[PDB]
């Protein structure tokens, strides 16, 4: 059975549902596949790990000793078995180590969604599994003509917003997809006319895109420690392609990555220079903007389908004493995002 989908779409489907890629991500995080196989992942186990990780975070920040931290750290390694043989696991005694485990759980959530999609549903050998797996995304995916104005605008956005501090690689756009998740347009209606709507980047491991397409971008679950995210539990975006592209976690051994373009209803922005692990926005605020030292040239903004595209070259923002080299944007209501495009990127590493 041969699928009728365009070849770029078929290859995309194979990328996101690649089971061996899910295993490789788990191994990359040091998880013990024998004790925690991909098929044994569950959301409740992940949430329990989140909760334990919160206790470690509270102990770490409140200034505890390694003896007091030891029991809390060991508890986390019980819920998520790691591959350390018969040696004691590394102690989670500092905020950086705890942060790494927060990031691991974030990725396990999307992997569990992807595998759950593959192992659910029906099996029909008369259909092409590419077609079967495509239908599980509840997302309409179309290839954008390379000569369309959409493509030129998107390519210029990629070409102009690569940061100098991310010059270990440059980006080649292979395929541009126009994506429409079922029900997302309806969910976006209260914000579709809001001011300060921008087209922003969101990169992520390829293993997270089956979950992102079928369920959309989500906020971290209630069990996740809010102190594990620089601006709290929201959905994070960038206006520099390279800043988002770094979160694809590509390498010489895997140079193909995926990145999202989404219309984000920012509205009135809460502008911050340093970490603020907030639960809600102040009254009247719709989003947070981490103020970067560098910003795309404001005068170079253009309009695509009524949405501002900040594709200008990077220049100084005039903001002093900030923790961020480049901007980032956070919304705390999943309804404020309307995904528009998905790009397949080739990373040419210059190292
Ligand atoms: O993606 C997740 O793991 C988490 C959990 C849940 O999916 C929601 N989520 C985030 O949106 C999230 C992402 C980052 C990384 C990041 N920071 N800044 C950027 O500009 C940026 C641009 C593109 C891709 C990533 C980034 C940090 C904290 C977060 F909450």
Swiss-Prot record:
It is found in: Cytoplasm. There is a cross-link at residue 88 (Glycyl lysine isopeptide (Lys-Gly) (interchain with G-Cter in SUMO2)). Changing residue 248 to R: <0.5% of wild-type activity. Changing residue 53 to F: Leads to constitutive activity in absence of DNA damage due to unfolding of the PARP alpha-helical domain, relieving autoinhibition. The active site is at 328 (for poly [adp-ribose] polymerase activity). Changing residue 166 to A: Strongly reduced serine ADP-ribosylation, caused by abolished interaction with HPF1. Residues 128-351 form the PARP catalytic domain. Changing residue 222 to G: Does not affect DNA-independent poly-ADP-ribosyltransferase activity. Changing residue 223 to Q: Does not affect ADP-ribosyltransferase activity. Changing residue 326 to H: 14% of wild-type activity and increased branching 15-fold. The modification Phosphoserine is found at residues 122, 126. It comes from the Eukaryota. There is a cross-link at residue 88 (Glycyl lysine isopeptide (Lys-Gly) (interchain with G-Cter in SUMO1)). NAD(+) binds at residues 202-204, 211, 218, 244. Residues 2-119 form the PARP alpha-helical domain. Interacts (when auto-poly-ADP-ribosylated) with AIFM1. Promotes AIFM1-mediated apoptosis. This form, which translocates into the cytoplasm following cleavage by caspase-3 (CASP3) and caspase-7 (CASP7) in response to apoptosis, is auto-poly-ADP-ribosylated and serves as a poly-ADP-ribose carrier to induce AIFM1-mediated apoptosis. This is Poly [ADP-ribose] polymerase 1, processed C-terminus. It comes from Homo sapiens (Human). The chain holds residues 661 to 1011 of 1014 of the full protein.
């Amino acid at each position: 059975p041969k699928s009728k989908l365009p070849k770029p779409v078929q290859d995309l489907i194979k990328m996101i549902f690649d089971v061996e890629s899910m295993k490789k991500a788990m191994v990359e995080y040091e998880i013990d596949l024998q004790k925690m196989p991909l098929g044994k992942l569950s959301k409740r186990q992940i949430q329990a790990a989140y909760s334990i990780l919160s206790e470690v975070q509270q102990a770490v920040s409140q200034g505890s000793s390694d003896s007091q931290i030891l029991d809390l750290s060991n508890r986390f390694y019980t819920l998520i078995p790691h591959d350390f043989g018969m040696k004691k696991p590394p102690l989670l005694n500092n905020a950086d180590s705890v942060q790494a485990k927060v990031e691991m759980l974030d990725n396990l959530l999307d992997i569990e969604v992807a595998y759950s999609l593959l192992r659910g549903g029906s099996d029909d050998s008369s259909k092409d599994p590419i077609d079967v797996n495509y239908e599980k995304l509840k997302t309409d995916i179309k290839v954008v003509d390379r000569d369309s104005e959409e493509a030129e605008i998107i390519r210029k956005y990629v070409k102009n917003t690569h940061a100098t501090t991310h010059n270990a690689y440059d980006l080649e756009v292979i395929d541009i997809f126009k994506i429409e998740r079922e029900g997302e347009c309806q969910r976006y209606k209260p914000f579709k006319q809001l001011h300060n709507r921008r087209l922003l980047w969101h990169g992520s491991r390829t293993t997270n895109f089956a979950g992102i397409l079928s369920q959309g971008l989500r906020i971290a679950p209630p069990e996740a420690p809010v102190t594990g995210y620089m601006f709290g539990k929201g959905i994070y975006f960038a206006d520099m392609v390279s800043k988002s592209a770094n979160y694809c976690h590509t390498s010489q051994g895997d140079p193909i990555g995926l990145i999202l373009l989404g219309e984000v209803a920012l509205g009135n922005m809460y502008e911050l220079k340093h970490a603020s692990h907030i639960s809600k926005l102040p009254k009247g605020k719709h989003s947070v903007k981490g103020l970067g030292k560098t910003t795309p040239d404001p005068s170079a903004n253009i309009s695509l389908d009524g949405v501002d595209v900040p594709l200008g070259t990077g220049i100084s923002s005039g903001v002093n004493d900030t923790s961020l080299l480049y901007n980032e944007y956070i919304v705390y209501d999943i309804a404020q995002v309307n995904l528009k495009y998905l790009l397949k990127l080739k990373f040419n590493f210059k190292t």
